[PDB]
Design an enzyme around this catalytic site. Structure first.
Site, mmCIF file in Angstrom:
data_model
loop_
_atom_site.group_PDB
_atom_site.id
_atom_site.type_symbol
_atom_site.label_atom_id
_atom_site.label_comp_id
_atom_site.label_asym_id
_atom_site.label_seq_id
_atom_site.Cartn_x
_atom_site.Cartn_y
_atom_site.Cartn_z
ATOM 1 N N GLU A 137 -3.443 7.434 -6.334
ATOM 2 C CA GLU A 137 -3.197 6.372 -5.706
ATOM 3 C C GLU A 137 -4.013 6.186 -4.348
ATOM 4 O OE1 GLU A 137 0.999 8.455 -3.955
ATOM 5 O OE2 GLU A 137 0.789 6.332 -4.255
ATOM 6 N N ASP B 172 8.889 -1.323 -0.347
ATOM 7 C CA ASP B 172 9.139 0.062 -0.170
ATOM 8 C C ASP B 172 7.668 0.417 0.773
ATOM 9 O OD1 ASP B 172 6.856 0.477 -1.759
ATOM 10 O OD2 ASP B 172 7.608 2.690 -2.338
ATOM 11 N N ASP C 179 -0.003 1.558 -3.230
ATOM 12 C CA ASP C 179 -0.630 2.458 -2.462
ATOM 13 C C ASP C 179 -2.122 2.584 -2.469
ATOM 14 O OD1 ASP C 179 1.726 5.059 -1.847
ATOM 15 O OD2 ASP C 179 0.541 4.300 -0.380
ATOM 16 N N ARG D 179 10.102 13.664 -5.565
ATOM 17 C CA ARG D 179 8.709 13.197 -4.969
ATOM 18 C C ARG D 179 8.918 13.714 -3.290
ATOM 19 N NH1 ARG D 179 6.062 7.227 -5.032
ATOM 20 N NH2 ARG D 179 7.614 6.615 -3.983
HETATM 21 O O1 LIG Z 1 1.773 2.100 -5.748
HETATM 22 C C1 LIG Z 1 2.378 3.133 -5.451
HETATM 23 O O2 LIG Z 1 2.033 3.541 -4.235
HETATM 24 C C2 LIG Z 1 3.993 3.433 -5.579
HETATM 25 O O3 LIG Z 1 4.088 4.780 -5.444
HETATM 26 C C3 LIG Z 1 4.990 2.714 -5.424
HETATM 27 C C4 LIG Z 1 6.401 2.804 -5.328
HETATM 28 O O4 LIG Z 1 6.469 3.860 -5.057
HETATM 29 C C5 LIG Z 1 7.221 1.710 -5.256
HETATM 30 C C6 LIG Z 1 6.576 0.441 -4.864
HETATM 31 C C7 LIG Z 1 7.559 -0.596 -4.528
HETATM 32 C C8 LIG Z 1 9.089 -0.372 -4.693
HETATM 33 C C9 LIG Z 1 9.529 0.789 -5.090
HETATM 34 C C10 LIG Z 1 8.455 1.748 -5.358
HETATM 35 N N1 LIG Z 1 9.307 3.084 -5.395
HETATM 36 O O5 LIG Z 1 8.674 3.903 -6.184
HETATM 37 O O6 LIG Z 1 10.730 3.240 -5.614
HETATM 38 MG MG LIG Z 2 3.071 4.995 -3.284
#
Ligand SMILES: O=C(O)/C(O)=C/C(=O)c1ccccc1[N+](=O)[O-]
Ligand SMILES: [Mg+2]
Ligand SMILES: [Mg+2]
Length: 704
Positions: free
Chosen positions: A414, A613, A442, A323
């Site tokens: 997102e 995150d 997001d 990513r």
């Molecule tokens: O909802 C989105 O924007 C999305 O991409 C979410 C994530 O990236 C994420 C969210 C919380 C913890 C860990 C991660 N992760 O991906 O490791």
């Molecule tokens: Mg995200």
């Protein structure tokens, strides 16, 4: 200054040496051709990148004024007028080709891991195979009722429940002609079919096709390999093993094929703010593609005997995505002649794409066998932003000497302007796209920020059930299936953040494959092996064809802003949201800023471990920034909350630097505050600007 001039660019030396000395050797790419490529791509693409970023601000400002002067017909008409809501393109079918089977065909879990942590990234790549006994025994899917509690030593009462759980799984996934697996006493392979010994008879597989292979002599094998909905189950057979001793068939474990694909994250779960940080990131990504990253080492592939008698192998590793970061940020790892920083997203394409070539070749045994480089691109707004990412990948393929369209793109849906134009976003990458995925965290932050001036939003938790998000989730599947994604590309849903609540994940996350998703995000190898269960009970391929052609979500549903009804909360409800939000913000930010940790577990107000995150951070601060904006709370409340919760987060961390009692002396504490007080003024609510600046400022005062 320790920089390298290359045309108009000044490359931070640590990054310069790493590319020449580690990422370029092996690829046949001449270093000066590479760096003239960087120079030229940066010069040619940076202006539109910036034009696109200005498009964002202009649209948000018009939406802001609009709210400040709730008819949906008017809203939809205004969004169309300002070019936010673009027309729907004519129906079409994607032409993406050269994609591995783990993405075209197989439905299953998808792990995401921070690429800056080598031990994690290795376990994730290895998590293509996972012990089910371990996942049931280790989590709360086997409850710790009286007599079934985990101790310092093995609880056979609990382990027997684990066996019983797995036996029921085998029965419901790979049925016998008659009888059950729980009554099994042995397994043999004879005349190419699998024969299971029962007490009084001897049955075989209801669908003998589900028999996939075995290791050891067919006369009495060491393991039995089964398939069901494209995913492999391996029964391990070892009577003198600790669990096998107790098993009626001497079964030692049930191995599940689990994390089919893994996303190595350079974005929202890492903290990389300069060339030093990106080079650790890039180096791990290189060691993954080269196969030699060691903290712990990448697993070899697995060897089986086909039911016919031949040998064959299966991949021991999860097919890796990377990513990249999106179009917003710049990183001073490269500055130009005038001192301007270079866009980080353009650099990731060049550098992760280069590195990924090592994954297309033999490692002293590969990633993609069909020649693709799988790049998740996050945080895009609309189809123009997709076409730009496509153009960027086109110019990087030139610089790298890759065939055109080698660099495939997993689209994150997102951002609101992507959702309401999703068909056009899929079409913009019709020959490049490998998934669409509902980045719902997001996508909630952008939901709050877009309509920030309209009024107060509903509490953070209410949001997972608002109309707009239920509509966005269906609309995503409908668009993917419509573009012919079934059998070509992944339709993906979002992350389960309750890392400890595995019984709840097994009970509720089945909703995702049932909704037509061929993949969905898990936070751990364990969570991947337990989410693998749902793809054995749900035929996603069947589900997707039952869905084909439906239109389940209108544009008005998608545009239903999550405003709070008139005076909908008591004082105790308002205070708890604030306390719970401030603590999640604090507990995350303090490890981001003081230690450069981009993801960590932070327990919310109800003591539930949430994997935090940057996206969950954008929700927290945007929500509080919105309540502050519309009078729901005062600035006294925000500060009282931030100060009440700060010492609790200190306790939860007790080589780290406390925030209390001297709050305004903590860079991490002041960053938390700024994310809220400035949150309404960050572009689209994005938290990187505040986070990168405050991280850089901690690293600087730590160096003095
Ligand atoms: O909802 C989105 O924007 C999305 O991409 C979410 C994530 O990236 C994420 C969210 C919380 C913890 C860990 C991660 N992760 O991906 O490791
Ligand atoms: Mg995200
Ligand atoms: Mg089935």
């Amino acid at each position: 200054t320790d920089r390298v001039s290359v045309g108009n660019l000044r490359i931070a030396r640590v990054l310069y040496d790493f590319v020449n000395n580690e990422a370029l050797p092996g690829t046949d790419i001449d270093p000066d051709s590479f760096w003239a490529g960087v120079d030229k791509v940066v010069a040619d693409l940076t202006p539109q990148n910036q034009a696109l970023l200005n498009a964002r601000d202009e649209l948000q400002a018009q939406i802001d004024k609009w709210h400040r002067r709730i008819d949906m017909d008017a809203y939809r008409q205004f969004l169309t007028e300002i070019g936010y809501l673009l027309p729907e393109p004519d129906d079409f079918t994607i032409t993406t080709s050269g994609v591995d089977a783990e993405i075209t065909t197989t439905a299953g879990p998808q792990l995401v891991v921070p690429v800056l942590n080598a031990r994690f990234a290795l376990n994730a790549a290895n998590a293509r195979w996972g012990s089910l006994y371990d996942a049931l025994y280790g989590t709360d899917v086997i409850p710790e009722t009286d007599g079934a509690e985990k101790g310092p030593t093995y609880n056979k009462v609990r382990g027997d429940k684990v066996i019983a759980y797995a036996r029921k799984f085998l029965d419901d996934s790979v049925p016998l002609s008659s009888g059950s697996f729980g009554d099994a006493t042995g397994f043999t392979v004879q005349d190419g079919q699998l024969v299971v010994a029962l007490p009084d008879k001897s049955t075989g597989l209801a669908n003998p096709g589900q028999f996939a292979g075995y290791t050891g002599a067919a006369e009495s094998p060491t393991s039995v390999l089964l398939i069901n909905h494209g995913l492999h189950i391996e029964i391990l057979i070892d009577p003198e093993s600790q669990v096998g001793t107790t098993d009626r068939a001497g079964v030692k474990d049930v191995i599940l094929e689990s994390a089919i694909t893994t996303i190595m994250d350079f974005e929202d779960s890492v903290a990389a703010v300069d060339a030093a940080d990106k080079v650790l990131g890039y180096r791990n990504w290189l060691g993954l593609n080269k196969g030699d990253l060691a903290a712990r080492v990448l697993n070899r592939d697995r060897n089986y005997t086909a039911p016919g008698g031949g040998q064959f192998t299966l991949p021991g590793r999860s097919l890796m995505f990377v990513r990249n970061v999106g179009h917003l940020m710049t990183n001073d790892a490269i500055v130009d002649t005038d001192g301007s920083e270079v866009f980080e997203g353009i650099m990731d394409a060049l550098f992760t794409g280069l590195i990924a070539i090592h994954g297309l070749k033999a490692s002293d045994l590969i990633n993609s066998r069909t020649g693709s480089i799988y790049i998740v691109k996050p945080k895009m707004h609309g189809p123009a932003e997709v076409a730009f990412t496509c153009e960027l990948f086109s110019r990087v393929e030139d610089v790298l000497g890759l065939p055109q369209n080698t660099m495939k793109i997993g689209i994150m849906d997102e951002e609101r302007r992507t959702t309401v134009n999703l068909k056009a976003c899929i079409k913009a990458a019709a020959d490049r796209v490998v998934f669409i995925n509902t980045g719902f965290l997001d996508r909630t932050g952008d939901e709050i920020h877009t309509s920030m001036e309209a009024g107060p939003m509903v509490r953070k938790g209410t949001m997972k059930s608002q109309p707009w998000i239920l509509a966005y989730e269906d609309h995503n599947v409908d668009a993917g299936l419509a573009a012919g994604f079934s059998g070509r590309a992944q339709v993906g849903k979002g992350m389960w953040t309750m890392t400890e609540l595995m019984a709840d994940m097994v009970e509720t996350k089945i909703a995702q494959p049932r909704a037509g998703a061929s993949t969905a995000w898990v936070p751990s190898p364990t969570a991947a092996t337990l989410h693998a269960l749902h793809y054995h009970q749900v035929d996603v391929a069947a589900v997707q064809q039952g869905l084909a052609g439906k239109r389940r979500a209108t544009i008005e549903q998608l545009l239903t802003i999550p405003l709070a009804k008139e005076l909908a909360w008591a004082p105790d409800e308002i205070r708890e949201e604030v306390d719970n939000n401030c603590q999640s913000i604090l507990g995350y930010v303090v490890r981001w800023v003081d230690q450069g940790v981009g993801c960590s577990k932070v327990p919310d107000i109800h003591d539930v471990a949430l994997m935090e995150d940057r996206a969950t951070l954008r929700i927290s601060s945007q929500l509080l920034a919105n309540w502050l904006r519309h009078g729901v709370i005062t600035s006294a409340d925000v500060r009282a909350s931030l100060e009440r919760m700060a010492p609790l987060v200190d306790r939860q961390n007790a080589a780290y630097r406390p925030m209390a009692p001297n709050f305004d002396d903590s860079i991490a504490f002041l960053a938390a505050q700024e994310l809220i007080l400035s949150g309404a003024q960050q572009p689209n609510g994005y938290t990187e600007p505040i986070l990168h600046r405050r991280r850089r400022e901690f690293k600087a005062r730590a160096a003095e």
